[PDB]
Amino acid sequence: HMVKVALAGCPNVGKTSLFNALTGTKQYVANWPGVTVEKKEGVFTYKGYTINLIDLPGTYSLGYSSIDEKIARDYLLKGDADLVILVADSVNPEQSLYLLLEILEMEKKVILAMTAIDEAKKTGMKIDRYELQKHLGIPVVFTSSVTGEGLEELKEKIVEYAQKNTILHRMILDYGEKVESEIKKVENFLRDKKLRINPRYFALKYLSGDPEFYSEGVKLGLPELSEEERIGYRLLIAKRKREYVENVVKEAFA
Ligand SMILES: Nc1nc2c(ncn2[C@@H]2O[C@H](COP(=O)(O)OP(=O)(O)O)[C@@H](O)[C@H]2O)c(=O)[nH]1
């Protein structure tokens, strides 16, 4: 019984440390196809399940311009992982949570690993794990590569949540009447197409001028957008995500 897992996260949040802690010496070097960027893969067993762990290049966000974000995003959207672990810096969680929302809009299964929880405790931070699960709709595990906190529970959660396919997660962030109308237009236009991607996600990246999806959207016959229109959609979407994240932090962090 094999489970394929990807580690996603911003640069310098503690992904490598968590990767090492989970896999030990059972890891291997290789290259991603077509680039020189190192691909790290590791293996660990848990209750007779065998987990293959891929560490993705660090990404502040999941655009499509830098080679690291191309690699990571292509894997997330087009790859074969059964679930993803979003590794977040517990101490300064804002950018990590923004990255998470991006993944949730792709409609992939994700576990939130709030790592460096030892530095959170040390600095007097109070993080409500159940408030996080409530606003994010996914399993949350507090981890520390320094203390070992949560490592085993994360392994348990990986096999448990990989086997839980009856109850699904759904995020729909309301972007306001205007952006929602345009999303509706785009979904209705792609309704009879063979999108290998979530249409709401497709529409969002198209409106905001994503290099991949804006270009593909136009290909499929959607209207071209001015620089001002793309800049404006991108800003509105970003602002709404930031607002949601600020509310999550408000509710879950004391
Ligand atoms: N306090 C604390 N520090 C950590 C933890 N995990 C990683 N670090 C430190 O955070 C820095 C970045 O960690 P690293 O694994 O290289 O992050 P990466 O860039 O995401 O691969 C390093 O200095 C680590 O020593 C943790 O759980 N607790």
Side-chain angles (χ1 to χ4, degrees), residues 82-84 104 108-112 137-139 155-162 164-165 167-169:
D82 295 295
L83 61 101
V84 50
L104 298 178
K108 300 300 170 191
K109 290 211 294 198
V110 55
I111 291 170
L112 176 66
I138 61 197
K155 290 191 208 160
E156 173 190 278
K157 197 59 62 56
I158 290 167
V159 301
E160 176 216 322
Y161 183 54
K164 275 193 183 52
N165 15 59
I167 301 315
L168 305 184
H169 170 82

mmCIF file with all atom_site columns, all heavy atoms in Angstrom, residues 82-84 104 108-112 137-139 155-165 167-169, unseen atoms left out:
data_model
loop_
_atom_site.group_PDB
_atom_site.id
_atom_site.type_symbol
_atom_site.label_atom_id
_atom_site.label_alt_id
_atom_site.label_comp_id
_atom_site.label_asym_id
_atom_site.label_entity_id
_atom_site.label_seq_id
_atom_site.pdbx_PDB_ins_code
_atom_site.Cartn_x
_atom_site.Cartn_y
_atom_site.Cartn_z
_atom_site.occupancy
_atom_site.B_iso_or_equiv
_atom_site.pdbx_formal_charge
_atom_site.auth_seq_id
_atom_site.auth_comp_id
_atom_site.auth_asym_id
_atom_site.auth_atom_id
_atom_site.pdbx_PDB_model_num
ATOM 1   N N   . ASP A 1 82  ? -0.848  11.777 -4.013 1.00 0.00 ? 82  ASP A N   1
ATOM 2   C CA  . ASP A 1 82  ? -2.144  11.457 -3.417 1.00 0.00 ? 82  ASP A CA  1
ATOM 3   C C   . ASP A 1 82  ? -2.569  12.571 -2.477 1.00 0.00 ? 82  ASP A C   1
ATOM 4   O O   . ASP A 1 82  ? -3.754  12.843 -2.303 1.00 0.00 ? 82  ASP A O   1
ATOM 5   C CB  . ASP A 1 82  ? -2.076  10.123 -2.668 1.00 0.00 ? 82  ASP A CB  1
ATOM 6   C CG  . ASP A 1 82  ? -1.814  8.948  -3.591 1.00 0.00 ? 82  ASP A CG  1
ATOM 7   O OD1 . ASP A 1 82  ? -2.677  8.663  -4.444 1.00 0.00 ? 82  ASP A OD1 1
ATOM 8   O OD2 . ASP A 1 82  ? -0.754  8.296  -3.451 1.00 0.00 ? 82  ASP A OD2 1
ATOM 9   N N   . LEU A 1 83  ? -1.594  13.227 -1.862 1.00 0.00 ? 83  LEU A N   1
ATOM 10  C CA  . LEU A 1 83  ? -1.898  14.416 -1.088 1.00 0.00 ? 83  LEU A CA  1
ATOM 11  C C   . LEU A 1 83  ? -0.666  15.276 -0.917 1.00 0.00 ? 83  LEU A C   1
ATOM 12  O O   . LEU A 1 83  ? 0.453   14.849 -1.202 1.00 0.00 ? 83  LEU A O   1
ATOM 13  C CB  . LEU A 1 83  ? -2.517  14.066 0.269  1.00 0.00 ? 83  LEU A CB  1
ATOM 14  C CG  . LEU A 1 83  ? -1.704  13.225 1.241  1.00 0.00 ? 83  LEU A CG  1
ATOM 15  C CD1 . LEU A 1 83  ? -1.078  14.087 2.319  1.00 0.00 ? 83  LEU A CD1 1
ATOM 16  C CD2 . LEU A 1 83  ? -2.606  12.177 1.856  1.00 0.00 ? 83  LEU A CD2 1
ATOM 17  N N   . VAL A 1 84  ? -0.890  16.494 -0.458 1.00 0.00 ? 84  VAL A N   1
ATOM 18  C CA  . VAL A 1 84  ? 0.208   17.437 -0.279 1.00 0.00 ? 84  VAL A CA  1
ATOM 19  C C   . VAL A 1 84  ? 0.264   17.876 1.170  1.00 0.00 ? 84  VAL A C   1
ATOM 20  O O   . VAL A 1 84  ? -0.759  17.987 1.841  1.00 0.00 ? 84  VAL A O   1
ATOM 21  C CB  . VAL A 1 84  ? 0.088   18.682 -1.226 1.00 0.00 ? 84  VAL A CB  1
ATOM 22  C CG1 . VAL A 1 84  ? -1.284  19.294 -1.143 1.00 0.00 ? 84  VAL A CG1 1
ATOM 23  C CG2 . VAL A 1 84  ? 1.158   19.732 -0.910 1.00 0.00 ? 84  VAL A CG2 1
ATOM 24  N N   . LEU A 1 104 ? -5.561  25.121 -2.067 1.00 0.00 ? 104 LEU A N   1
ATOM 25  C CA  . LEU A 1 104 ? -6.935  24.716 -1.801 1.00 0.00 ? 104 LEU A CA  1
ATOM 26  C C   . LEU A 1 104 ? -7.852  25.042 -2.987 1.00 0.00 ? 104 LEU A C   1
ATOM 27  O O   . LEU A 1 104 ? -8.808  24.313 -3.262 1.00 0.00 ? 104 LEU A O   1
ATOM 28  C CB  . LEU A 1 104 ? -7.454  25.374 -0.517 1.00 0.00 ? 104 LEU A CB  1
ATOM 29  C CG  . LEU A 1 104 ? -6.719  25.008 0.783  1.00 0.00 ? 104 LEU A CG  1
ATOM 30  C CD1 . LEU A 1 104 ? -7.294  25.770 1.963  1.00 0.00 ? 104 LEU A CD1 1
ATOM 31  C CD2 . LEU A 1 104 ? -6.802  23.513 1.023  1.00 0.00 ? 104 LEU A CD2 1
ATOM 32  N N   . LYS A 1 108 ? -6.869  20.242 -4.349 1.00 0.00 ? 108 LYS A N   1
ATOM 33  C CA  . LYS A 1 108 ? -6.040  19.082 -4.011 1.00 0.00 ? 108 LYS A CA  1
ATOM 34  C C   . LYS A 1 108 ? -6.181  18.778 -2.525 1.00 0.00 ? 108 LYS A C   1
ATOM 35  O O   . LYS A 1 108 ? -6.460  19.684 -1.738 1.00 0.00 ? 108 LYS A O   1
ATOM 36  C CB  . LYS A 1 108 ? -4.562  19.347 -4.341 1.00 0.00 ? 108 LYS A CB  1
ATOM 37  C CG  . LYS A 1 108 ? -4.289  19.653 -5.806 1.00 0.00 ? 108 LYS A CG  1
ATOM 38  C CD  . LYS A 1 108 ? -4.717  18.513 -6.705 1.00 0.00 ? 108 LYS A CD  1
ATOM 39  C CE  . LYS A 1 108 ? -4.665  18.904 -8.171 1.00 0.00 ? 108 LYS A CE  1
ATOM 40  N NZ  . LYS A 1 108 ? -5.333  17.883 -9.027 1.00 0.00 ? 108 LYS A NZ  1
ATOM 41  N N   . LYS A 1 109 ? -5.995  17.513 -2.140 1.00 0.00 ? 109 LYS A N   1
ATOM 42  C CA  . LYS A 1 109 ? -5.987  17.135 -0.727 1.00 0.00 ? 109 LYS A CA  1
ATOM 43  C C   . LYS A 1 109 ? -4.698  17.629 -0.069 1.00 0.00 ? 109 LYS A C   1
ATOM 44  O O   . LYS A 1 109 ? -3.605  17.377 -0.568 1.00 0.00 ? 109 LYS A O   1
ATOM 45  C CB  . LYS A 1 109 ? -6.133  15.609 -0.536 1.00 0.00 ? 109 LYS A CB  1
ATOM 46  C CG  . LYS A 1 109 ? -7.508  15.061 -0.880 1.00 0.00 ? 109 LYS A CG  1
ATOM 47  C CD  . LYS A 1 109 ? -7.879  13.837 -0.029 1.00 0.00 ? 109 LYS A CD  1
ATOM 48  C CE  . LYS A 1 109 ? -6.992  12.647 -0.312 1.00 0.00 ? 109 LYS A CE  1
ATOM 49  N NZ  . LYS A 1 109 ? -7.616  11.372 0.181  1.00 0.00 ? 109 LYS A NZ  1
ATOM 50  N N   . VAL A 1 110 ? -4.834  18.334 1.052  1.00 0.00 ? 110 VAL A N   1
ATOM 51  C CA  . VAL A 1 110 ? -3.682  18.920 1.719  1.00 0.00 ? 110 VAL A CA  1
ATOM 52  C C   . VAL A 1 110 ? -3.771  18.774 3.232  1.00 0.00 ? 110 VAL A C   1
ATOM 53  O O   . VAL A 1 110 ? -4.853  18.856 3.815  1.00 0.00 ? 110 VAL A O   1
ATOM 54  C CB  . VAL A 1 110 ? -3.541  20.420 1.381  1.00 0.00 ? 110 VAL A CB  1
ATOM 55  C CG1 . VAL A 1 110 ? -4.819  21.139 1.712  1.00 0.00 ? 110 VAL A CG1 1
ATOM 56  C CG2 . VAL A 1 110 ? -2.360  21.044 2.138  1.00 0.00 ? 110 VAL A CG2 1
ATOM 57  N N   . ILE A 1 111 ? -2.619  18.538 3.849  1.00 0.00 ? 111 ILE A N   1
ATOM 58  C CA  . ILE A 1 111 ? -2.475  18.582 5.297  1.00 0.00 ? 111 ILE A CA  1
ATOM 59  C C   . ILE A 1 111 ? -1.619  19.815 5.609  1.00 0.00 ? 111 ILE A C   1
ATOM 60  O O   . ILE A 1 111 ? -0.558  20.001 5.009  1.00 0.00 ? 111 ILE A O   1
ATOM 61  C CB  . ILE A 1 111 ? -1.736  17.342 5.834  1.00 0.00 ? 111 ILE A CB  1
ATOM 62  C CG1 . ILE A 1 111 ? -2.607  16.097 5.690  1.00 0.00 ? 111 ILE A CG1 1
ATOM 63  C CG2 . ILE A 1 111 ? -1.367  17.524 7.303  1.00 0.00 ? 111 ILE A CG2 1
ATOM 64  C CD1 . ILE A 1 111 ? -1.845  14.828 5.978  1.00 0.00 ? 111 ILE A CD1 1
ATOM 65  N N   . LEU A 1 112 ? -2.074  20.654 6.536  1.00 0.00 ? 112 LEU A N   1
ATOM 66  C CA  . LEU A 1 112 ? -1.266  21.785 6.990  1.00 0.00 ? 112 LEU A CA  1
ATOM 67  C C   . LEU A 1 112 ? -0.343  21.349 8.128  1.00 0.00 ? 112 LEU A C   1
ATOM 68  O O   . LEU A 1 112 ? -0.806  20.891 9.176  1.00 0.00 ? 112 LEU A O   1
ATOM 69  C CB  . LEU A 1 112 ? -2.157  22.941 7.453  1.00 0.00 ? 112 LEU A CB  1
ATOM 70  C CG  . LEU A 1 112 ? -1.383  24.127 8.040  1.00 0.00 ? 112 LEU A CG  1
ATOM 71  C CD1 . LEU A 1 112 ? -0.527  24.788 6.954  1.00 0.00 ? 112 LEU A CD1 1
ATOM 72  C CD2 . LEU A 1 112 ? -2.352  25.137 8.629  1.00 0.00 ? 112 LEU A CD2 1
ATOM 73  N N   . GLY A 1 137 ? -10.528 23.996 6.711  1.00 0.00 ? 137 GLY A N   1
ATOM 74  C CA  . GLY A 1 137 ? -11.229 22.790 6.307  1.00 0.00 ? 137 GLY A CA  1
ATOM 75  C C   . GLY A 1 137 ? -10.359 21.573 6.041  1.00 0.00 ? 137 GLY A C   1
ATOM 76  O O   . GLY A 1 137 ? -10.792 20.652 5.352  1.00 0.00 ? 137 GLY A O   1
ATOM 77  N N   . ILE A 1 138 ? -9.140  21.562 6.579  1.00 0.00 ? 138 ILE A N   1
ATOM 78  C CA  . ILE A 1 138 ? -8.212  20.439 6.400  1.00 0.00 ? 138 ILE A CA  1
ATOM 79  C C   . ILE A 1 138 ? -7.551  20.043 7.718  1.00 0.00 ? 138 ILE A C   1
ATOM 80  O O   . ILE A 1 138 ? -7.636  20.777 8.708  1.00 0.00 ? 138 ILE A O   1
ATOM 81  C CB  . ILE A 1 138 ? -7.081  20.780 5.415  1.00 0.00 ? 138 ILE A CB  1
ATOM 82  C CG1 . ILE A 1 138 ? -6.262  21.966 5.961  1.00 0.00 ? 138 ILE A CG1 1
ATOM 83  C CG2 . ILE A 1 138 ? -7.643  21.035 4.027  1.00 0.00 ? 138 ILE A CG2 1
ATOM 84  C CD1 . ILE A 1 138 ? -5.389  22.646 4.930  1.00 0.00 ? 138 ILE A CD1 1
ATOM 85  N N   . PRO A 1 139 ? -6.908  18.862 7.746  1.00 0.00 ? 139 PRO A N   1
ATOM 86  C CA  . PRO A 1 139 ? -6.177  18.448 8.946  1.00 0.00 ? 139 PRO A CA  1
ATOM 87  C C   . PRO A 1 139 ? -4.987  19.368 9.189  1.00 0.00 ? 139 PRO A C   1
ATOM 88  O O   . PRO A 1 139 ? -4.291  19.726 8.239  1.00 0.00 ? 139 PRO A O   1
ATOM 89  C CB  . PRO A 1 139 ? -5.688  17.040 8.585  1.00 0.00 ? 139 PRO A CB  1
ATOM 90  C CG  . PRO A 1 139 ? -6.639  16.560 7.526  1.00 0.00 ? 139 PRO A CG  1
ATOM 91  C CD  . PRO A 1 139 ? -6.915  17.807 6.722  1.00 0.00 ? 139 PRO A CD  1
ATOM 92  N N   . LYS A 1 155 ? 2.750   11.504 10.400 1.00 0.00 ? 155 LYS A N   1
ATOM 93  C CA  . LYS A 1 155 ? 2.799   10.261 9.642  1.00 0.00 ? 155 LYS A CA  1
ATOM 94  C C   . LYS A 1 155 ? 1.460   9.538  9.711  1.00 0.00 ? 155 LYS A C   1
ATOM 95  O O   . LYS A 1 155 ? 0.973   9.001  8.716  1.00 0.00 ? 155 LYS A O   1
ATOM 96  C CB  . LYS A 1 155 ? 3.909   9.348  10.172 1.00 0.00 ? 155 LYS A CB  1
ATOM 97  C CG  . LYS A 1 155 ? 5.326   9.830  9.877  1.00 0.00 ? 155 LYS A CG  1
ATOM 98  C CD  . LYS A 1 155 ? 6.329   8.719  10.215 1.00 0.00 ? 155 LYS A CD  1
ATOM 99  C CE  . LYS A 1 155 ? 7.672   9.293  10.595 1.00 0.00 ? 155 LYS A CE  1
ATOM 100 N NZ  . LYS A 1 155 ? 8.511   8.335  11.375 1.00 0.00 ? 155 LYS A NZ  1
ATOM 101 N N   . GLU A 1 156 ? 0.875   9.524  10.903 1.00 0.00 ? 156 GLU A N   1
ATOM 102 C CA  . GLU A 1 156 ? -0.428  8.904  11.105 1.00 0.00 ? 156 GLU A CA  1
ATOM 103 C C   . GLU A 1 156 ? -1.455  9.616  10.229 1.00 0.00 ? 156 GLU A C   1
ATOM 104 O O   . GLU A 1 156 ? -2.271  8.984  9.543  1.00 0.00 ? 156 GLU A O   1
ATOM 105 C CB  . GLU A 1 156 ? -0.830  9.007  12.573 1.00 0.00 ? 156 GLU A CB  1
ATOM 106 C CG  . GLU A 1 156 ? -2.247  8.553  12.879 1.00 0.00 ? 156 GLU A CG  1
ATOM 107 C CD  . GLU A 1 156 ? -2.676  8.901  14.294 1.00 0.00 ? 156 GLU A CD  1
ATOM 108 O OE1 . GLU A 1 156 ? -2.327  8.144  15.225 1.00 0.00 ? 156 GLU A OE1 1
ATOM 109 O OE2 . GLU A 1 156 ? -3.356  9.937  14.482 1.00 0.00 ? 156 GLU A OE2 1
ATOM 110 N N   . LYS A 1 157 ? -1.409  10.946 10.257 1.00 0.00 ? 157 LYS A N   1
ATOM 111 C CA  . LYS A 1 157 ? -2.375  11.749 9.517  1.00 0.00 ? 157 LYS A CA  1
ATOM 112 C C   . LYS A 1 157 ? -2.246  11.509 8.005  1.00 0.00 ? 157 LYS A C   1
ATOM 113 O O   . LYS A 1 157 ? -3.246  11.419 7.291  1.00 0.00 ? 157 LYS A O   1
ATOM 114 C CB  . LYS A 1 157 ? -2.214  13.233 9.864  1.00 0.00 ? 157 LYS A CB  1
ATOM 115 C CG  . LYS A 1 157 ? -3.411  14.092 9.474  1.00 0.00 ? 157 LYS A CG  1
ATOM 116 C CD  . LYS A 1 157 ? -4.706  13.624 10.144 1.00 0.00 ? 157 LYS A CD  1
ATOM 117 C CE  . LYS A 1 157 ? -4.632  13.729 11.668 1.00 0.00 ? 157 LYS A CE  1
ATOM 118 N NZ  . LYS A 1 157 ? -4.301  15.104 12.137 1.00 0.00 ? 157 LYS A NZ  1
ATOM 119 N N   . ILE A 1 158 ? -1.011  11.383 7.524  1.00 0.00 ? 158 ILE A N   1
ATOM 120 C CA  . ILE A 1 158 ? -0.766  11.058 6.120  1.00 0.00 ? 158 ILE A CA  1
ATOM 121 C C   . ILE A 1 158 ? -1.501  9.794  5.663  1.00 0.00 ? 158 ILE A C   1
ATOM 122 O O   . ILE A 1 158 ? -2.191  9.819  4.654  1.00 0.00 ? 158 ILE A O   1
ATOM 123 C CB  . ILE A 1 158 ? 0.752   10.942 5.813  1.00 0.00 ? 158 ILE A CB  1
ATOM 124 C CG1 . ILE A 1 158 ? 1.406   12.326 5.894  1.00 0.00 ? 158 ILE A CG1 1
ATOM 125 C CG2 . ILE A 1 158 ? 0.983   10.351 4.427  1.00 0.00 ? 158 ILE A CG2 1
ATOM 126 C CD1 . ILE A 1 158 ? 2.930   12.273 5.907  1.00 0.00 ? 158 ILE A CD1 1
ATOM 127 N N   . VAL A 1 159 ? -1.359  8.692  6.400  1.00 0.00 ? 159 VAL A N   1
ATOM 128 C CA  . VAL A 1 159 ? -2.024  7.455  6.012  1.00 0.00 ? 159 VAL A CA  1
ATOM 129 C C   . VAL A 1 159 ? -3.529  7.536  6.263  1.00 0.00 ? 159 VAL A C   1
ATOM 130 O O   . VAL A 1 159 ? -4.325  6.992  5.494  1.00 0.00 ? 159 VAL A O   1
ATOM 131 C CB  . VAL A 1 159 ? -1.419  6.217  6.729  1.00 0.00 ? 159 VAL A CB  1
ATOM 132 C CG1 . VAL A 1 159 ? 0.061   6.080  6.402  1.00 0.00 ? 159 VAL A CG1 1
ATOM 133 C CG2 . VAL A 1 159 ? -1.630  6.305  8.228  1.00 0.00 ? 159 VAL A CG2 1
ATOM 134 N N   . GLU A 1 160 ? -3.920  8.220  7.330  1.00 0.00 ? 160 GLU A N   1
ATOM 135 C CA  . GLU A 1 160 ? -5.324  8.271  7.718  1.00 0.00 ? 160 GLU A CA  1
ATOM 136 C C   . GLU A 1 160 ? -6.120  9.098  6.727  1.00 0.00 ? 160 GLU A C   1
ATOM 137 O O   . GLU A 1 160 ? -7.176  8.683  6.252  1.00 0.00 ? 160 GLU A O   1
ATOM 138 C CB  . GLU A 1 160 ? -5.478  8.849  9.127  1.00 0.00 ? 160 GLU A CB  1
ATOM 139 C CG  . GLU A 1 160 ? -6.912  9.029  9.583  1.00 0.00 ? 160 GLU A CG  1
ATOM 140 C CD  . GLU A 1 160 ? -7.099  10.266 10.448 1.00 0.00 ? 160 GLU A CD  1
ATOM 141 O OE1 . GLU A 1 160 ? -6.202  10.579 11.262 1.00 0.00 ? 160 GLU A OE1 1
ATOM 142 O OE2 . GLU A 1 160 ? -8.145  10.935 10.305 1.00 0.00 ? 160 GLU A OE2 1
ATOM 143 N N   . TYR A 1 161 ? -5.589  10.272 6.410  1.00 0.00 ? 161 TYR A N   1
ATOM 144 C CA  . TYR A 1 161 ? -6.264  11.220 5.544  1.00 0.00 ? 161 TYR A CA  1
ATOM 145 C C   . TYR A 1 161 ? -6.173  10.772 4.086  1.00 0.00 ? 161 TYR A C   1
ATOM 146 O O   . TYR A 1 161 ? -7.039  11.100 3.273  1.00 0.00 ? 161 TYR A O   1
ATOM 147 C CB  . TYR A 1 161 ? -5.647  12.601 5.751  1.00 0.00 ? 161 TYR A CB  1
ATOM 148 C CG  . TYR A 1 161 ? -6.273  13.730 4.966  1.00 0.00 ? 161 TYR A CG  1
ATOM 149 C CD1 . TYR A 1 161 ? -7.639  13.986 5.034  1.00 0.00 ? 161 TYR A CD1 1
ATOM 150 C CD2 . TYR A 1 161 ? -5.482  14.573 4.191  1.00 0.00 ? 161 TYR A CD2 1
ATOM 151 C CE1 . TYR A 1 161 ? -8.202  15.042 4.325  1.00 0.00 ? 161 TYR A CE1 1
ATOM 152 C CE2 . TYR A 1 161 ? -6.034  15.626 3.480  1.00 0.00 ? 161 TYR A CE2 1
ATOM 153 C CZ  . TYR A 1 161 ? -7.392  15.861 3.549  1.00 0.00 ? 161 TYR A CZ  1
ATOM 154 O OH  . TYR A 1 161 ? -7.931  16.916 2.837  1.00 0.00 ? 161 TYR A OH  1
ATOM 155 N N   . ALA A 1 162 ? -5.136  10.007 3.761  1.00 0.00 ? 162 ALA A N   1
ATOM 156 C CA  . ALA A 1 162 ? -5.020  9.435  2.424  1.00 0.00 ? 162 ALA A CA  1
ATOM 157 C C   . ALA A 1 162 ? -6.109  8.375  2.207  1.00 0.00 ? 162 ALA A C   1
ATOM 158 O O   . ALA A 1 162 ? -6.582  8.167  1.083  1.00 0.00 ? 162 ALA A O   1
ATOM 159 C CB  . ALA A 1 162 ? -3.637  8.838  2.218  1.00 0.00 ? 162 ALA A CB  1
ATOM 160 N N   . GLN A 1 163 ? -6.507  7.718  3.298  1.00 0.00 ? 163 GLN A N   1
ATOM 161 C CA  . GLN A 1 163 ? -7.534  6.678  3.252  1.00 0.00 ? 163 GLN A CA  1
ATOM 162 C C   . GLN A 1 163 ? -8.946  7.260  3.402  1.00 0.00 ? 163 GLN A C   1
ATOM 163 O O   . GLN A 1 163 ? -9.936  6.579  3.133  1.00 0.00 ? 163 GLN A O   1
ATOM 164 C CB  . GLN A 1 163 ? -7.274  5.603  4.322  1.00 0.00 ? 163 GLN A CB  1
ATOM 165 N N   . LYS A 1 164 ? -9.033  8.518  3.831  1.00 0.00 ? 164 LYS A N   1
ATOM 166 C CA  . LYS A 1 164 ? -10.322 9.203  3.949  1.00 0.00 ? 164 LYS A CA  1
ATOM 167 C C   . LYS A 1 164 ? -10.703 9.921  2.661  1.00 0.00 ? 164 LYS A C   1
ATOM 168 O O   . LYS A 1 164 ? -10.320 11.062 2.433  1.00 0.00 ? 164 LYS A O   1
ATOM 169 C CB  . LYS A 1 164 ? -10.333 10.184 5.125  1.00 0.00 ? 164 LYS A CB  1
ATOM 170 C CG  . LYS A 1 164 ? -10.679 9.535  6.452  1.00 0.00 ? 164 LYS A CG  1
ATOM 171 C CD  . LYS A 1 164 ? -10.990 10.565 7.515  1.00 0.00 ? 164 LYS A CD  1
ATOM 172 C CE  . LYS A 1 164 ? -11.257 9.883  8.840  1.00 0.00 ? 164 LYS A CE  1
ATOM 173 N NZ  . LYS A 1 164 ? -10.152 8.946  9.194  1.00 0.00 ? 164 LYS A NZ  1
ATOM 174 N N   . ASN A 1 165 ? -11.468 9.232  1.827  1.00 0.00 ? 165 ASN A N   1
ATOM 175 C CA  . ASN A 1 165 ? -11.866 9.756  0.535  1.00 0.00 ? 165 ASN A CA  1
ATOM 176 C C   . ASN A 1 165 ? -13.376 9.928  0.437  1.00 0.00 ? 165 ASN A C   1
ATOM 177 O O   . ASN A 1 165 ? -13.896 10.300 -0.609 1.00 0.00 ? 165 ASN A O   1
ATOM 178 C CB  . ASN A 1 165 ? -11.335 8.851  -0.581 1.00 0.00 ? 165 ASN A CB  1
ATOM 179 C CG  . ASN A 1 165 ? -10.872 7.489  -0.069 1.00 0.00 ? 165 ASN A CG  1
ATOM 180 O OD1 . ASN A 1 165 ? -11.647 6.729  0.524  1.00 0.00 ? 165 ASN A OD1 1
ATOM 181 N ND2 . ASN A 1 165 ? -9.599  7.174  -0.303 1.00 0.00 ? 165 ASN A ND2 1
ATOM 182 N N   . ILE A 1 167 ? -15.300 11.932 2.750  1.00 0.00 ? 167 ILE A N   1
ATOM 183 C CA  . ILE A 1 167 ? -15.588 13.333 3.017  1.00 0.00 ? 167 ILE A CA  1
ATOM 184 C C   . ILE A 1 167 ? -14.560 14.251 2.350  1.00 0.00 ? 167 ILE A C   1
ATOM 185 O O   . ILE A 1 167 ? -13.376 14.210 2.676  1.00 0.00 ? 167 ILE A O   1
ATOM 186 C CB  . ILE A 1 167 ? -15.600 13.651 4.536  1.00 0.00 ? 167 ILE A CB  1
ATOM 187 C CG1 . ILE A 1 167 ? -16.639 12.801 5.282  1.00 0.00 ? 167 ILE A CG1 1
ATOM 188 C CG2 . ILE A 1 167 ? -15.817 15.148 4.765  1.00 0.00 ? 167 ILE A CG2 1
ATOM 189 C CD1 . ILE A 1 167 ? -18.001 12.709 4.619  1.00 0.00 ? 167 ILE A CD1 1
ATOM 190 N N   . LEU A 1 168 ? -15.028 15.091 1.432  1.00 0.00 ? 168 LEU A N   1
ATOM 191 C CA  . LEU A 1 168 ? -14.161 15.996 0.684  1.00 0.00 ? 168 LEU A CA  1
ATOM 192 C C   . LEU A 1 168 ? -14.177 17.424 1.228  1.00 0.00 ? 168 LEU A C   1
ATOM 193 O O   . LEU A 1 168 ? -15.126 17.854 1.882  1.00 0.00 ? 168 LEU A O   1
ATOM 194 C CB  . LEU A 1 168 ? -14.552 15.999 -0.796 1.00 0.00 ? 168 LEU A CB  1
ATOM 195 C CG  . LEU A 1 168 ? -14.571 14.618 -1.459 1.00 0.00 ? 168 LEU A CG  1
ATOM 196 C CD1 . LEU A 1 168 ? -14.879 14.727 -2.945 1.00 0.00 ? 168 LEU A CD1 1
ATOM 197 C CD2 . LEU A 1 168 ? -13.250 13.896 -1.230 1.00 0.00 ? 168 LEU A CD2 1
ATOM 198 N N   . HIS A 1 169 ? -13.097 18.138 0.940  1.00 0.00 ? 169 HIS A N   1
ATOM 199 C CA  . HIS A 1 169 ? -12.922 19.532 1.312  1.00 0.00 ? 169 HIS A CA  1
ATOM 200 C C   . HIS A 1 169 ? -13.330 20.402 0.143  1.00 0.00 ? 169 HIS A C   1
ATOM 201 O O   . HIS A 1 169 ? -13.015 20.094 -1.008 1.00 0.00 ? 169 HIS A O   1
ATOM 202 C CB  . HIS A 1 169 ? -11.448 19.771 1.617  1.00 0.00 ? 169 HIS A CB  1
ATOM 203 C CG  . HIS A 1 169 ? -11.084 21.211 1.774  1.00 0.00 ? 169 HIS A CG  1
ATOM 204 N ND1 . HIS A 1 169 ? -11.286 21.906 2.947  1.00 0.00 ? 169 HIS A ND1 1
ATOM 205 C CD2 . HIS A 1 169 ? -10.522 22.086 0.909  1.00 0.00 ? 169 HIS A CD2 1
ATOM 206 C CE1 . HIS A 1 169 ? -10.871 23.148 2.795  1.00 0.00 ? 169 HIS A CE1 1
ATOM 207 N NE2 . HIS A 1 169 ? -10.404 23.287 1.568  1.00 0.00 ? 169 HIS A NE2 1
#
